[PDB]
Amino acid sequence: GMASGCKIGPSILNSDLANLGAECLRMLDSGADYLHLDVMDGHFVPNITFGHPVVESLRKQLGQDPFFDMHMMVSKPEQWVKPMAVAGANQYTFHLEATENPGALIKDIRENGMKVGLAIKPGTSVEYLAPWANQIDMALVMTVEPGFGGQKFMEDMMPKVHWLRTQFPSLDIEVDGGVGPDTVHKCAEAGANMIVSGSAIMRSEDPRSVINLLRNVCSEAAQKR
Amino acid sequence: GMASGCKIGPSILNSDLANLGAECLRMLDSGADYLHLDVMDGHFVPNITFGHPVVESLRKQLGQDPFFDMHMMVSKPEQWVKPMAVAGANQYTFHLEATENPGALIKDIRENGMKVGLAIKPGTSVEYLAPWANQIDMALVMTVEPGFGGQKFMEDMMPKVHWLRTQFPSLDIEVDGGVGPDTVHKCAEAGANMIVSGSAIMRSEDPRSVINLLRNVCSEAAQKR
Ligand SMILES: [Zn+2]
Ligand SMILES: [Zn+2]
Numbered sequence: 001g002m003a004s005g006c007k008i009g010p011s012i013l014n015s016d017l018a019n020l021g022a023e024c025l026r027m028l029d030s031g032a033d034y035l036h037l038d039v040m041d042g043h044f045v046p047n048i049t050f051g052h053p054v055v056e057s058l059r060k061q062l063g064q065d066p067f068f069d070m071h072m073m074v075s076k077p078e079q080w081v082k083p084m085a086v087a088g089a090n091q092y093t094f095h096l097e098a099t100e101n102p103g104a105l106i107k108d109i110r111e112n113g114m115k116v117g118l119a120i121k122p123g124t125s126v127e128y129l130a131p132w133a134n135q136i137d138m139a140l141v142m143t144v145e146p147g148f149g150g151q152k153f154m155e156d157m158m159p160k161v162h163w164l165r166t167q168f169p170s171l172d173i174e175v176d177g178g179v180g181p182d183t184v185h186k187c188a189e190a191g192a193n194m195i196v197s198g199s200a201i202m203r204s205e206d207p208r209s210v211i212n213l214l215r216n217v218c219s220e221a222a223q224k225r
Numbered sequence: 226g227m228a229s230g231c232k233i234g235p236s237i238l239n240s241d242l243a244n245l246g247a248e249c250l251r252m253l254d255s256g257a258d259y260l261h262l263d264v265m266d267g268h269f270v271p272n273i274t275f276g277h278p279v280v281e282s283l284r285k286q287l288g289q290d291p292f293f294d295m296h297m298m299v300s301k302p303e304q305w306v307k308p309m310a311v312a313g314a315n316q317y318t319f320h321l322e323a324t325e326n327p328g329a330l331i332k333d334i335r336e337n338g339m340k341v342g343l344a345i346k347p348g349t350s351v352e353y354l355a356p357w358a359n360q361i362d363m364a365l366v367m368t369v370e371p372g373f374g375g376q377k378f379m380e381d382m383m384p385k386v387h388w389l390r391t392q393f394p395s396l397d398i399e400v401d402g403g404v405g406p407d408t409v410h411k412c413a414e415a416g417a418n419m420i421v422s423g424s425a426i427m428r429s430e431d432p433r434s435v436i437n438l439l440r441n442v443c444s445e446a447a448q449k450r
Contacts, residue, residue, distance in 0.1 A: 016246075016282055018286045019286070042268075053238065054274075
């Protein structure tokens with residue numbers, strides 16, 4: 001199959017947001033494959049993080065090479081496609097629950113020169129990604145309810161990851177929510193190959209070591225597939 | 226009267242948002258009286274800037290002394306009072322157009338230990354501020370339409386500032402929108418004593434010089450009142 005082999009994308013929300021450029025560089029210097037940037041508009045989820053203006057500053061600072069995956073937890077994803085492309089995002093991961101026209105939105109993301117991610121919240125059945133799997137670059141199975149503080153990793157989401165992996169062997173599948181050295185085993189064995197992790201990396205004196213561990217656990221499961 | 230002296234609060238949206246702490250420290254080291262932080266939720270205005278998690282990082286870096294004025298351009302300002310108070314905001318400036326119960330919000334802001342600001346956009350008659358002028362710490366008369374890039378300063382907003390100053394000699398009155406060395410005379414003469422400016426200060430080589438100029442022009446007007 002053509003699934004990408006394991007990628008680790010640190011989430012930066014638990015980083016020092018007052019020094020976000022330096023934090024990102026630290027993640028990339030520790031071996032991050034991509035940067036997972038969580039954008040929340042206070043409507044789709046009960047929190048407000050940052051929008052395309054922060055993204056543009058980050059792009060000016062880091063240059064063109066680093067890959068930015070925008071996790072768009074916003075209620076009108078159609079509205080931010082162009083501003084994010086102009087800001088320099090590489091991938092636009094929108095929520096199935098935030099539009100009535102996913103098809104048109106996928107076309108617009110592509111028309112704007114970005115890769116397409118499609119995410120689903122815990123209550124949304126995995127079956128609803130099926131008609132879109134072959135038309136996207138990456139699927140995101142969330143493993144916490146977004147926008148809430150201090151949510152435990154949800155083991156009962158793994159059947160969604162396994163079902164996606166079984167039906168679409170070449171789809172890139174991301175997990176996002178409480179993923180760390182302990183929960184990554186379950187995510188990898190279930191089929192996920194794109195790992196988002198935040199506090200487990202940000203709490204460490206040695207983020208390179210934590211990213212290595214995540215990638216290595218992910219790989220050992222992927223080589224068995 | 227008890228109108229505060231002249232105060233300059235740089236706006237930081239044209240700063241390097243990937244180095245926001247360093248940018249705020251530079252403003253403070255340049256004589257800024259406060260920091261004016263524009264919060265936009267992508268609904269009340271067509272832009273998403275940043276929320277309380279970024280304010281919390283800023284407060285942790287800069288310590289307890291600097292004063293943060295939150296310009297809350299959000300559709301549900303009731304929702305972010307407690308989160309902003311916990312993040313360490315000093316003043317919460319909400320928009321009169323963003324609520325049908327300004328009275329209860331003013332109380333809630335004060336219960337959460339913050340100063341109270343009340344803002345009106347250009348299309349909103351200044352008469353609508355009057356019932357609340359004595360009950361707030363600061364009124365904000367916006368001098369551009371919020372949410373759009375590169376808007377010209379609106380000279381036709383000056384009569385709103387003057388009416389406010391005449392009716393409420395002890396009220397602190399803020400102007401926000403394309404205010405700089407070339408428009409500050411008009412704002413001061415009209416009656417404004419809190420001056421928010423962006424690029425004119427941010428992109429200067431001598432930001433202390435620009436802050437001093439803005440305060441000095443403002444004082445020359447204030448002395449004649
Ligand atoms: Zn995310
Ligand atoms: Zn403002």
